[PDB]
Every structure is written in C-alpha cells, then in structure tokens.
Design an enzyme around this catalytic site. Sequence first.
Site, PDB file in Angstrom:
ATOM      1  N   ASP A  50       0.775  -1.248   0.000  1.00 23.06           N
ATOM      2  CA  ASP A  50       0.000   0.000   0.000  1.00 23.06           C
ATOM      3  C   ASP A  50       0.809   1.303   0.000  1.00 23.06           C
ATOM      4  O   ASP A  50       0.301   2.321   0.478  1.00 23.06           O
ATOM      5  CB  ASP A  50      -0.959   0.036   1.223  1.00 23.06           C
ATOM      6  N   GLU A  91      -7.770   5.203  -4.157  1.00 20.44           N
ATOM      7  CA  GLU A  91      -6.566   5.655  -3.442  1.00 20.44           C
ATOM      8  C   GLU A  91      -5.292   5.572  -4.297  1.00 20.44           C
ATOM      9  O   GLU A  91      -4.354   6.358  -4.080  1.00 20.44           O
ATOM     10  CB  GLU A  91      -6.405   4.983  -2.085  1.00 20.44           C
ATOM     11  N   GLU A 106      -7.676  -3.302  -3.781  1.00 20.71           N
ATOM     12  CA  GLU A 106      -8.995  -2.935  -3.302  1.00 20.71           C
ATOM     13  C   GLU A 106      -9.335  -1.484  -3.642  1.00 20.71           C
ATOM     14  O   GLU A 106     -10.266  -1.245  -4.406  1.00 20.71           O
ATOM     15  CB  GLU A 106      -9.115  -3.195  -1.800  1.00 20.71           C
TER      16      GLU A 106
END
Length: 752
Positions: A440, A520, A516
């Site tokens: 991430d 973002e 996911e």
Amino acid sequence: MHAVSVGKGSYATEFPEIDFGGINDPGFRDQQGEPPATIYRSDRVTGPMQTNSWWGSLAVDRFSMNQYPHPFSVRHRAEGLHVFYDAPHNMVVHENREAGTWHIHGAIGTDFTIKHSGTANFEQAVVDDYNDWYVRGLLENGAHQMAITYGVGSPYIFVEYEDGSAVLDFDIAPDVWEMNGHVIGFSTHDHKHYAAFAPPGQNWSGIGSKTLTNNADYIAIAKLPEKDGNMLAKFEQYAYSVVRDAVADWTYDEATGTVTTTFEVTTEAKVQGAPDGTIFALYPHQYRHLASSSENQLLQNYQYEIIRGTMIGLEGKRFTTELTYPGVLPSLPDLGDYDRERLIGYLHDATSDYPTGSDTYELGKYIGKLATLAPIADQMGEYELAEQFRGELKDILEDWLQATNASGQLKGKNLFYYNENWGTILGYHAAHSSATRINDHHFHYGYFVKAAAEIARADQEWAKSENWGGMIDLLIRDFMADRDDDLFPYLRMFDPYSGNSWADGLATFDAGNNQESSSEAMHAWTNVILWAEATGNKALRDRAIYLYTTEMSAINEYFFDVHQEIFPEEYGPEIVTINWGGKMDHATWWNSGKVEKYAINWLPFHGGSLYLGHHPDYVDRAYEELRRDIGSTDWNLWSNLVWMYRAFTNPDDALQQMEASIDDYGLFDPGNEKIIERGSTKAQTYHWIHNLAELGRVDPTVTANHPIYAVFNKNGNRTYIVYNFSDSPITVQFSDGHSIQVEPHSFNIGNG
Ligand SMILES: OC[C@H]1O[C@@H](O[C@@H]2[C@@H](O)[C@H](O[C@@H]3[C@@H](O)[C@H](O[C@@H]4[C@@H](O)[C@H](O[C@@H]5[C@@H](O)[C@H](O[C@@H]6[C@@H](O)[C@H](O[C@@H]7[C@@H](O)[C@H](O[C@@H]8[C@@H](O)[C@H](O[C@@H]9[C@@H](O)[C@H](O[C@@H]%10[C@@H](O)[C@H](O)O[C@H](CO)[C@H]%10O)O[C@H](CO)[C@H]9O)O[C@H](CO)[C@H]8O)O[C@H](CO)[C@H]7O)O[C@H](CO)[C@H]6O)O[C@H](CO)[C@H]5O)O[C@H](CO)[C@H]4O)O[C@H](CO)[C@H]3O)O[C@H](CO)[C@H]2O)[C@H](O)[C@@H](O)[C@@H]1O
Ligand SMILES: OC[C@H]1O[C@@H](O[C@@H]2[C@@H](O)[C@H](O[C@@H]3[C@@H](O)[C@@H](O)O[C@H](CO)[C@H]3O)O[C@H](CO)[C@H]2O)[C@H](O)[C@@H](O)[C@@H]1O
Ligand SMILES: OC[C@H]1O[C@@H](O[C@@H]2[C@@H](O)[C@H](O)O[C@H](CO)[C@H]2O)[C@H](O)[C@@H](O)[C@@H]1O
C-alpha cells in the site's frame, strides 16, 4: 552513520528501536517490522528488488503460490510447474447474503505439470530475470535446472532445460489430436486445448499415455484459443522466440492529451530463423484502445476467456495503445451556490478533527483532510484558517521527513527507513502490513504527497529539493521510480500490462496479487501530477499522467465494467471491490456494510476524482443498485460519500439527502462514521455537492493543451476550469476551440 540527509530532512539506514507508545497489542507491535529476510532470486538478479507484482510469490515463497499469467494459471512446486486454465465449468459466481458478499472465481487445479526428466525434487524456485511484465522462474536442484519464462498477456510458457529433457505429466491421459512429431496439439480429458513445441527432429513420445516426453532441452507450451490446426500452425511460428526483454514505453502529448504506450518484446531464437516477436494476448483495457497502426496485427478469432473478460491475440514485435488524459485539479474552485457562512462554520468545525492513529495510513487520511480544507478556507476568505491548516501540514511533514531527533539519534516513530535488503522506504508507525509486506505505499504516501502539493501551491520555497522537496521526491521514487533508480525498482506499484496497481508487496496468495482501493491509487497519481506541476518537474509530472490515465482505463473495465461486458450476467453488484489476478470479490479487507463495498473505490474525494463521472449511465446504475440493496437512502455508513458520488449525475437528489442529514451529528467523532466518513468533512461534502449542482456533468469529450484543468457541461453550457501553478500568466486552448487566459497562482474562475 544511521541516517542519510536529504535536503533539510533525512531517512534512517538502520532499523530504528521502535517506540511502541505503551501499546501492548501484539498485532500493532508485529506491524512495526521489516519485509522477509530471504528473497528467492538468483545472483543474476541484483539491486533493488521488484515488488507489488503479479508474480511476487515466486520471490517470497520457497517455490511459489498460484499465479495468473493470463491466459494461464501456474504454480511452482518441487515436482515442476503446474499449468491450469479456468474453463467455463471451472468458473463460479457465489453470493453470501448474510455477509453481503459476492465472489467470481475459478479453481486451483492442474491440467498438467511441466517436468524435468532428471528430478521431481527441485529444492526451490527463484526469480532469475524479469522485465516490465514477464518473469523467468528457475527451478533448481544442483546441476538440474528448469527455466520457465511466462507473463500476463502471454499465451506461451517457454521452458529451458539444464542437464535434462522435457516431460508433461497428466492425471488422466490427454487426447493428442495433432501429432507433427516435434509439435503436438492436445486436449485435457475435460476438453481444454493446448499445444507443445520442440525443435525439429525432437519428437514427442508417450502419446495415448499419462506422460508425454521429449528429448529436447527446449519446449514451449501454448494455450490454444480453439482445437484448430490452423491456429496450431500460427503458434508454431512464434513458439521458438523466447521473450527476454519486454518494455512498456510511453509518451504524453500535452497539446492533445494523448498518452501513447508501446509494448515491445525482444526475443531470442531457439531455432534457425525464428522471428523477433511473439503472440500477445491483449486485455480489454488494451484492445479497446488499440492504435490504428497495430490493427493489422490482430489475430481476430484468437480469443481467450479469463476473469477479466475476453483476451485477444495479436502477433509481432510490438503493439500500441492510445488513451486520453482528462486533466486534474488541485481542488474544486469556488463556483457553488452554498450558504458561504454555513461553509465557513463547517471549516471552523474541522479544527476539532484529529488523526485516529499514529500509523502512516491514519495520519495520511488526516493530512489529506487538512490539505482538502485549505483551498476551501482560502475561497471563503478564511485566509488565516487556511494558513493554520497549511502550518499544521508543515509541522507534521517536517516531523515525519526527519529520521533523527534533536540529539542526532534515530527516532522511534514518525520517520522513514530504507530497507536495503529489498530496497524500499518504510514508514513507522506502519499499518496494513505497509512495512512487513511492503503493502500500500501508493495508498499511504499518496496522502503525504497531497499535503506536500497543497504546501507547494502556496509556498514554492518549502518545496525546493534542498528544503523539504527532496524527501517528498524520495517517497514518490519509492512507489513510482523511473528506470535505473539506484534505490528503488521500476514503477513499484504499477503493472504496465495489467494496467493497474497491485497493493500487496509479496503476492503470497493463491489468487495472485490484489487491489482494493483503486481510488486511493488514483489519488496518489493525482497528487504526484500536482506536486510535480507545482515544483516544475516535467518528467515526474508526465510519468504520473501516464499512471493516472492507464489506471483509469483498467478501473473502468475491471472495477466498474462500464461497458457491461466483463462481469457475468448472474453477478448481482455493479462493482467489483477487490480485483485479484485470479478472482473478483464484492467484499472488503475489513468488516464492513453495504456502502463501503462500493465507496472504498470512490474515496477520497479530491480534485482528481472527476474520472469517476466520465460514465454517467454507470454512475446511475451503480448508485441505483446500492440504493436497491440498502432499500432506501438511509446509508449504513459514509453517507456523505454516497451523496458526493450521486452528485455526478443527480445533484438535486444529492442536495436533498445532504440537507436532511448533514447536521445530524455535531463535531468530529471517530466512533461515528454514519454521516461523515473519517477522512472526509462536512465542509468538503457541502463544497463538493454545491459545486456539482452549479457545474453540471463532467465533460470528458473536451481536452486542453495544459494538464491542470476540468471541463463541465450543464445542459449544453460548458464551464472551463484551469489552475495555473506558474509565476507567469498562461493561455489554455481547449479542443472545442475555446480559449482562456489564467493569471499566476490562480483559477481562471472561482478563486473566491
Ligand atoms: O496507531 C496505530 C493503531 O493500530 C492498532 O493496531 C492494530 C491492531 O488493533 C490489530 O490487532 C488485531 C485485532 O484487531 C484482532 O481482532 C480481531 C478482529 O480483527 C476480528 O474482526 C473480524 C473481521 O476481520 C472480519 O472481517 C472480514 C475480513 O477479515 C475478510 O477479509 C477477507 C480475507 O480473509 C480474504 O483473505 C483470503 C486469504 O485468507 C487466503 O489465504 C490463503 C490461505 O488460507 C492458505 O492457507 C493454507 C490453507 O488453505 C490450507 O488448507 O492449509 C495450509 C496449512 O499450512 C495453509 O497454508 O494459503 C494460501 C496461499 O497458499 C492463501 O491464499 O487467500 C485469498 C486469496 O488467495 C484471500 O482472498 O480476502 C478477502 C478478499 O478476497 C477478504 O474479504 O472479509 C470479510 C468480508 O468483507 C470481512 O467480514 O469480520 C468479522 C465479523 O464478521 C470480525 O469479527 O474479530 C476477531 C474476533 O472478534 C478479533 O480477534 O485480533 C488480532 C489477534 O489475533 C490482532 O492482530 O492488528 C492490526 C494489524 O493486523 C494493527 O494495525 C492499535 O490497536 C491501535 O491502538 C493503534 O493506535
Ligand atoms: O469505521 C471504523 C473501521 O474502519 C476501518 O478502516 C478502514 C480501513 O481498514 C481501510 O483500509 C483500506 C485497505 O483495506 C486497503 O484498500 O488499503 C488502504 C490502507 O492501506 C485502505 O484503503 O480503509 C477504509 C477507508 O479509509 C477504513 O474505513 C478499520 O479497519 C476497522 O477496524 C474500523 O472498525
Ligand atoms: O494484500 C494487500 C492488502 O492487505 C491487507 O492485509 C491483509 C490482512 O488483512 C490479512 O489478515 O492478511 C494478509 C496477508 O496474509 C494481509 O495482506 C491490508 O489491510 C490492505 O490494506 C492491503 O491493501
């Protein structure tokens, strides 16, 4: 030395003694660690290690997990390489009504195993080489070696043997329907069609049995689109051209907005006169945007069914895609018909907000929130409040971007560290396995870049490389480095061929890698565009433009299915929440309700969010399905995000829902996200919805010859918005003939 100075900041070069802050929770404490010590790579692979890839489990596991080099699935094992293809009978769509989840997936089976005649007991499988989207896996047992070259978008698996020859092993004897000696066309018992290729004179043996053998030290496997001898002959032409290099080279034409990407392989000949080229299998996001000059290379009837829809064959050395960059903004301007005093009220309310954790993600959400508030404060004439917000951004960033305390020793928290083993910047405190799995980095660091971009918009001096810009540039390099970066692998997060970012650093799952929150990812790319424009870094800006535009094409196909061609008809929802290499889920990584399984792919809302409104029929379809499942407009959580999304196609409805509920609860409350999502504010929500109400629909049919703009269309009336980061005035030309002048450091309209 335990730290390296970068302008006024620094990063740690030694793992810090972590300050746990009295928190005893084992989960939290375990997050404050490092990625695996062991990397399964040969000594041919040196320097910063590639991560966040479709093939990553090969590097982390002793062998590998299940991988998805579409059209194949494969896995490395001691006995050899298992090869599989999800046929329609392998594919399922399941709903868990109680969980509110849906799952589109195949099987983890074996059609056959590619084996080495000398051993079925390999010691390990290592990464021996890789390029932009192919990998060379090497199964090793002393003198016995089997090198497997494969990739997403390759209908070939290339197999090279050391000290042995080829074996294909089956649980049930295959039907060999074409026997050309060195080339065979075969089907599994359950009718999946494949082909195998060896050099002329090296003939296949064991036909009619469970084990096909060949004396060659080289074979290729192909997945065939059909049981078709003519297709077999075509696959034979490229079966001996082993991919060694593969690059995705891009250009951004600023005048037109066109992002052009050329995918080019370089092959090595395994027989005399083998062509320099391959057969590519293109994904929908590629072939829907194929350049005219590549059309002649298409192999029309060569289709493969996979999780991501239909792949199509294309022959040759290269192909080209063409996409349109739609612009981004630093914020929405001041064009809404809001009660200005009410908005001022909400802006002051936001001073009560605080981060809900000490980790890079929760702190990230908070600084994104402040960076969003500052231009709105400016527009409302709350200039000192805007400065308070940017001052608070400065305080936070100047803390995090220094690895050492006043004494010169390494800090225990709020710092960045360079893990040399892999070659990655890790932030502590960490969460979501950002450190332990290298997860991430675009999601987290994107928020840091947002904060930096907002500072740079008002203060160019702060953003200089010798000041705080050097450290921001370092964070960006971690997640989206250019080629030949001494510290980081190329474009860490991004898969240039799959067209999307992959969130997991390690990819140690049997569904391959996953993403996911595509929003973002888009947030990260947006912020780099803004940062690079603010700091006059054209090369970095263009790279982020390439990423934004390419990711957009993948989002619209695989998360949204705007064209209604990819998701099975029996799949209920109008969104896939998590895309994997091998499956699609309507589900979240945490325990959530109905809204979140949609809105995790919308949040956060920012000046780069307008891509979400390019397909109004999709926006309507998705909203109506979520509303149907909720049963009303009483959203279970994150109400404001649903209202903001609804405003893309129906701002009157969005406005009505907002008026009824925005003031239901007062000041910031971490325990209650029913109305306001914790990364969002009343101020942002109110400012967004009212702006959309006045502006109308996003208009993606108009481009501009500068990158920081948006065009809206309200019943035929266009509004043109440009922000100018320059010290000088500019003229912007739009593709519909419209032209505007913009003053330095301002919007053309709605500066407030
Ligand atoms: O400032 C910082 C701040 O930080 C804080 O620190 C926190 C800290 O609090 C925290 O502490 C932890 C506690 O929170 C925890 O409490 C729990 C609580 O979490 C839990 O909540 C439940 C919810 O979690 C749950 O949500 C559901 C989701 O979980 C679910 O997610 C799914 C995924 O599961 C799924 O993943 C699959 C994956 O499993 C699969 O993996 C494969 C393997 O299975 C396989 O194994 C093989 C096996 O198959 C074979 O048979 O055998 C061999 C044996 O050897 C075995 O290896 O291997 C293969 C590979 O080969 C794997 O692939 O892989 C697939 C893909 O291939 C993957 O899909 O993925 C899907 C997406 O696809 C995902 O959706 O989803 C559902 C639906 O959305 C969701 O509901 O929901 C329930 C309610 O229903 C909740 O209860 O509840 C329990 C009980 O109450 C609590 O205990 O406790 C732990 C301790 O145990 C703590 O760690 O830790 C975090 C860090 O983690 C930390 O940040 C501080 O607190 C704070 O103070 C501080 O300020
Ligand atoms: O509302 C309280 C509730 O919030 C949960 O926080 C979630 C995050 O878990 C979620 O993380 C996302 C990841 O799954 C992944 O997509 O990557 C990033 C983080 O690296 C996130 O997008 O993000 C959403 C939106 O910000 C949060 O609401 C907590 O997990 C949960 O324990 C808590 O009860
Ligand atoms: O894989 C990327 C995503 O990983 C998520 O965490 C996972 C945990 O929830 C789960 O318990 O374990 C797996 C590893 O087996 C973790 O990857 C993060 O929460 C996501 O933010 C991240 O995108």
